[PDB]
Design a protein around this ligand. Structure first.
Ligand SMILES: [Mn+2]
Ligand SMILES: [Mn+2]
Lengths: 130, 130
């Protein structure tokens, strides 16, 4: 749903997708479970609401609702960078270089109805006055 | 369409909506014209692609595709902040108080297909190797 901040009404959903560096059977078993845990922890840290999270052997698909103060690149690098530090610190048998590649995919999601926009405009005028 | 940078494939579309302060009949004629010109110049400046722009007497509805480096709040405040400065400069009669209110609405837009995501994943593994 639409959320509100100081002087803001927003709905910011993003699909973030990225892959583990070189092994296609990296994110499995306990490693996959810890990966989900840390990504959820980071989301909570940033005030983001995870809509869907998939940690598959060959990729991560994170669909999340975030505050408007964050740029998609800032978010991707925070999720990837912080999760990698934690995951590599936890499992020694990894720790051989980078966990992720330096690329990521991001796509905005949403279908704002004209009624929702019309209503926001009417509300601002009602609030501010003419 | 999907776009790409150094190490990112992205689709970042946002709807920005905001209204002028108690003047519900000022964004007309020459002022409306200049406002549209200024918002288009700012978009070009930031590397954003305007999908649709509406400058109406009671509100601005900016639908734009932007680089992932920008936060929605930065964009909203830059578009509003810089246009206000330029507009008040060209039309001194608007120099009384703030041109815009401090509020704004922002909503992400998009319906990315699974095929696009699947292709991104396969392309990264093809480039990275396993
Ligand atoms: Mn998926
Ligand atoms: Mn509109």
């Amino acid at each position: 749903e639409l959320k509100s901040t100081r002087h803001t009404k927003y709905l910011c959903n993003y699909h973030f997708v990225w892959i583990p560096k070189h092994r296609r059977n990296t994110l499995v078993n306990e490693i996959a479970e810890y990966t989900k845990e840390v990504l959820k922890s980071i989301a909570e840290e940033l005030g983001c609401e995870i809509i869907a999270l998939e940690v598959m052997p060959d990729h991560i698909h994170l669909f999340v609702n975030c505050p408007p103060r964050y740029a998609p690149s800032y978010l991707a690098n925070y999720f990837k960078g912080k999760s990698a530090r934690l995951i590599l610190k936890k499992f020694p048998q990894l720790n051989k270089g980078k966990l992720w590649t330096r690329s990521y995919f991001v796509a905005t999601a949403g279908n704002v109805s004209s009624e929702v926009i019309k209503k926001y405009i009417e509300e601002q005028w009602r609030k501010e006055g003419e």
